[PDB]
Design an enzyme around this catalytic site. Sequence first.
Site, PDB file in Angstrom:
ATOM      1  N   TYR A 131      10.180 -42.121  25.507  1.00 38.27           N
ATOM      2  CA  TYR A 131      10.600 -41.241  25.351  1.00 38.27           C
ATOM      3  C   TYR A 131      10.294 -41.130  24.441  1.00 38.27           C
ATOM      4  CZ  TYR A 131      14.318 -43.232  22.395  1.00 38.27           C
ATOM      5  OH  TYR A 131      15.303 -43.542  21.469  1.00 38.27           O
ATOM      6  N   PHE A 150      12.518 -39.358  13.648  1.00 36.15           N
ATOM      7  CA  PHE A 150      11.642 -39.738  15.033  1.00 36.15           C
ATOM      8  C   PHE A 150      12.203 -41.111  15.317  1.00 36.15           C
ATOM      9  CE2 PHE A 150       8.348 -37.175  12.990  1.00 36.15           C
ATOM     10  CZ  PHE A 150       8.464 -36.814  11.469  1.00 36.15           C
ATOM     11  N   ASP A 151      12.526 -41.322  16.587  1.00 39.45           N
ATOM     12  CA  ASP A 151      12.475 -42.201  17.526  1.00 39.45           C
ATOM     13  C   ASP A 151      11.922 -42.197  18.721  1.00 39.45           C
ATOM     14  OD1 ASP A 151      14.482 -44.683  18.161  1.00 39.45           O
ATOM     15  OD2 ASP A 151      14.886 -43.030  19.975  1.00 39.45           O
ATOM     16  N   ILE A 155      23.249 -38.055  25.434  1.00 35.43           N
ATOM     17  CA  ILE A 155      23.553 -36.597  24.893  1.00 35.43           C
ATOM     18  C   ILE A 155      23.879 -36.051  26.180  1.00 35.43           C
ATOM     19  CG2 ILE A 155      23.634 -36.623  22.546  1.00 35.43           C
ATOM     20  CD1 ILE A 155      20.735 -35.453  23.540  1.00 35.43           C
ATOM     21  N   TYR A 166      24.949 -33.434  19.910  1.00 32.94           N
ATOM     22  CA  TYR A 166      25.737 -34.393  18.742  1.00 32.94           C
ATOM     23  C   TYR A 166      26.930 -32.783  17.652  1.00 32.94           C
ATOM     24  CZ  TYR A 166      22.941 -38.065  19.512  1.00 32.94           C
ATOM     25  OH  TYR A 166      22.113 -39.285  19.688  1.00 32.94           O
ATOM     26  N   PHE A 186      13.421 -33.910  22.084  1.00 33.54           N
ATOM     27  CA  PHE A 186      12.371 -34.671  22.924  1.00 33.54           C
ATOM     28  C   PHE A 186      11.255 -33.944  23.656  1.00 33.54           C
ATOM     29  CE2 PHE A 186      15.925 -37.842  22.145  1.00 33.54           C
ATOM     30  CZ  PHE A 186      16.701 -37.025  22.015  1.00 33.54           C
TER      31      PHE A 186
END
Length: 128
Positions: A45, A55-56, A75, A101, A118
């Site tokens: 992802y 960003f991740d 989540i 969240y 995402f």
Amino acid sequence: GAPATVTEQGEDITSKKDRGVLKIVKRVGNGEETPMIGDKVYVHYKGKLSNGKKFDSSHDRNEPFVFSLGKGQVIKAWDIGVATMKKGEIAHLLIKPEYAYGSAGSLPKIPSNATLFFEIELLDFKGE
Ligand SMILES: COc1cc2cc(c1OC)OCCCOC/C=C/C[C@@H](C)OC(=O)[C@@H]1CCCCN1C(=O)[C@H]2C1CCCCC1
């Protein structure tokens, strides 16, 4: 941008139909089979906050992200969204804070009332 396409044209996949998780399929996967609750799920992802401040990616870690579908290990929007995906599919999710969240957020990384986007690729899923 990719987010705005989803906000515009994107499929509402919530049960309550509150536009809380919106989805576009970007590359179609294979088989009729999507994962059942409890399945062990393998994804790559990329993710960001709509504020553009964080960003991740699974790639930053050089390996798939793995979790059990529907255990709340992610989540609510992931448990919903990935449950709708085929093996090999890439989708976009745009997510309201209620399915991420919420008002508390998760400080400092995620602020109060954050919206998240995402890109997800579903690699494989195996049974419990
Ligand atoms: C607020 O905390 C985080 C948020 C996110 C990533 C975090 C993170 O720190 C724990 O670490 C990177 C590797 C994942 O760590 C394992 C558990 C993740 C499960 C849970 C925290 O997150 C989620 O369920 C979602 C979906 C699965 C991928 C990660 N995702 C996130 O919310 C990202 C988030 C995405 C927007 C940009 C900042 C990070």
